[PDB]
């Protein structure tokens, strides 16, 4: 019977727990009592982008900090010029039930997918004037939850089967598959080094993967419920996660443990989406009550609110130059936010 | 004024895209979307197959059928290869016109169907969506209770006290034991529905068989009633 293997697993868990406990010499909260708080942060809606018919499910910024892609469950994929609000392209999808959206770092491609279990790559730059499907990647058994390009030829996906996969695009072949989660993998993000990525799943666990070795490096487990969103800290040494338990948490890859948690007694609804600012000092989180809260990432004080949306905040993202935040909602609008002097 | 020649041309392109979005907005609103749910034992496969015939990929995660009644277009969806856990993907459907819930009335498994319906009805995002409820395989239920070999009160002991409601319509000339059985099973779903509907959404029960052609008319009439209540709400008459 496996009870000996269970006992060995429990013994190993006890060993790991004690090792992590021994490292918890002092908390981040004690150390950051020195620094000045950020003070009140205020941001204004600088643009509203509108034209989607149904709820917006995802968005992603281009690396130029100016082009933006957005997906809605009416089956359009739209590319926006952020400065002018001009629509650059409108792409009709084969399936309405899109759930994820990505912009290639070169801007040559966008990727899309959802309940079809298929990830579709669209070529934006061709000798004809029209966008068309370059490749359809099929082999996941459940819905596509997230996808991110490593480059124009490699893309990483996660799905409702408890699995992530790395694909070639030239051949539609899974080059590697990552297995070990026991629930739906809900979100994914790449390290800046691109050699590593983290995934969060409906098992209240997060895992660190090596894209080259194809194996789980580490597992993090502080949350009490499904992890909906994950994001690397700009240094790449830490990441944040948001859950239906209404908390965010910050983990460091080398202390191997939770540094800090962001929560308040007035907040009792799930977190949909998370991002840092360019310095990492601000953590932005979107909520089912359709505000966004801005957190001092070092002190865990709440420091501001974005409060323009009429319905669930589904996605948000910060430009690579840090100049603006965009938020999308089931109200079917995107709003772009910036501070003021 | 201040725009360059190319900037004016880029704006003209953007306006033609909007002109296209405004066109297919009319197609999107003129079409009603339906989610079809039911366990493996339910006859839902026969419903879509029959309905696909009478009117109008190996890991496909979702399937669709199109049908039309009185020049009104319906798209009906049912999930394919998804896993058994559904608390996440079900949130996509928060904006369909109705959910069609199909039950095998002969597997008194019924408790499993009740717990499923209770979850759909109470969920934070699916509330405000009305449920059309097909109590299917009524022919098998009739034969099963007439054979007397297995007793509903082995599973629902309150059935010893239930008596046929005065609304009961035994129009087929059915045996009254069949009638009492049918309306008991129906009333167990209505017990759940009336406990929390708050007037925002309603359940529409129908007794059905796999061979029955009328199912397309049933869905049409219920969607008419659902949409009529929605208009009465937003015109502030309600």
């Amino acid at each position, epitope marked *: 019977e496996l009870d000996q293997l269970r006992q060995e697993a429990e013994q190993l868990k006890n060993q790991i727990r004690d090792a992590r406990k021994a490292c918890a010499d002092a908390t981040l909260s004690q150390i950051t009592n020195n620094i000045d708080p950020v003070g009140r942060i205020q941001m204004r809606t600088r643009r509203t982008l509108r034209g989607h018919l149904a709820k917006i499910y995802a968005m992603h910024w281009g690396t130029d900090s100016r082009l933006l892609v957005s997906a809605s469950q009416d089956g359009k994929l739209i590319i926006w010029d952020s400065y002018t609000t001009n629509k650059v392209h409108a792409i009709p999808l084969r399936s309405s039930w899109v759930m994820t959206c990505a912009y290639a770092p070169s801007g040559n491609y966008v990727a899309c997918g959802g309940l079809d279990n298929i990830c579709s790559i669209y070529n934006l730059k061709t000798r004809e004037g029209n966008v068309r499907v370059s490749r359809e990647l099929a082999g996941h058994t459940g819905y596509l939850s997230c996808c991110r390009f490593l480059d124009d030829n490699q893309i990483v996906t996660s799905s409702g089967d408890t699995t992530c996969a790395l694909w070639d695009i030239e051949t539609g072949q899974q080059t590697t598959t990552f297995t070990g989660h*026991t*629930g739906d993998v809900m979100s994914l993000s790449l390290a800046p080094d691109t050699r590593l990525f983290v995934s969060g799943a*409906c*098992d*209240a*666990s997060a895992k660190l993967w090596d894209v080259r070795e194809g194996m789980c490096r580490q597992t993090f*487990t502080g949350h*009490e*419920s*499904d992890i909906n969103a994950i994001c690397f800290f700009p240094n790449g040494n830490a990441f944040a996660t948001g859950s*239906d*338990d*209404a908390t965010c948490r910050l983990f460091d890859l080398r202390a191997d443990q939770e540094l800090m948690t962001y929560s308040h007694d007035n907040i*009792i609804c*799930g977190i949909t989406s998370v991002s840092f600012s360019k310095s990492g000092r601000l953590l932005l989180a979107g909520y089912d009550d359709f505000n966004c809260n801005v957190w001092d990432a070092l002190k865990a004080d709440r420091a501001g609110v974005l409060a323009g949306h009429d319905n669930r905040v589904s996605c948000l993202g910060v430009t690579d130059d840090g100049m603006a935040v965009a938020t999308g909602s089931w109200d079917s609008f995107l709003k772009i936010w910036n501070g003021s002097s | 004024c201040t725009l360059s020649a190319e900037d004016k041309a880029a704006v003209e392109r953007s306006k033609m895209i909007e002109k296209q979005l405004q066109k297919d907005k009319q197609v999107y609103r003129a079409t009603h979307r339906l989610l079809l749910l039911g366990a493996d034992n339910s006859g839902k496969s026969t419903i879509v197959k029959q309905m696909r015939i009478y009117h109008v990929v190996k890991t496909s995660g979702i399937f669709e059928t199109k049908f039309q009644v009185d020049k009104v277009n319906f798209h009906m969806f049912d999930v394919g290869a998804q896993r*058994d*856990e*559904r*608390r996440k993907w*079900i949130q996509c459907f928060n904006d369909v016109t109705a959910i069609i819930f199909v039950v095998d009335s002969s597997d008194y498994r019924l*408790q*499993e169907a009740l*717990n499923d319906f*209770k*979850s759909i009805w*109470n*969920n*934070r995002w699916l509330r405000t969506i009305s449920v059309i409820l097909f109590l299917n395989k009524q022919d098998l239920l009739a034969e099963k209770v007439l054979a007397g070999k297995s007793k509903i009160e082995d*599973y*629902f*002991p*309150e059935f010893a006290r239930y008596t046929t409601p005065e609304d009961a319509t035994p129009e087929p000339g059915e045996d009254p034991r069949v009638t009492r059985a049918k309306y008991f099973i129906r009333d167990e779903f209505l017990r759940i529905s009336t406990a*929390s509907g708050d007037g925002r959404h309603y359940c529409y029960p129908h007794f059905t068989c796999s061979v029955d052609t009328e199912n397309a008319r049933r869905i049409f009439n219920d969607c008419r009633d659902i949409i009529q209540r929605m208009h009465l709400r937003q015109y502030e008459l309600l």
Partner: nanobody
Amino acid sequence: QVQLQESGGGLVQPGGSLRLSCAASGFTFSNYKMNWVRQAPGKGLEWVSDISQSGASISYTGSVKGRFTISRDNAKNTLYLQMNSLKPEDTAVYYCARCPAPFTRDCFDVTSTTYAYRGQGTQVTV
């Protein structure tokens, strides 16, 4: 981490009694509705009973409606099932299973084949 561990199961005679106990850790026990689930040897999971956050609302399947009672102790992070007048058909693995999210009326997946927030289970033979 979230973990659940049932105890007090075992052999009992028909007409006998048992108390199952579940100890919960790694979550704010008071915020979640909780359930008992069982698996008879020939079939899948079936739901048995549930209890709301406060212990106010309670429900059962008809097969147990008069015979079992569920209770909870929010001061002690523990859940109980008093079982009386047990029958041979009650032989099963019994599992303690949390609802997925706090502060909510629904719980979809508690009877799924690989749900994450469910205990190891305890055998009961009759």
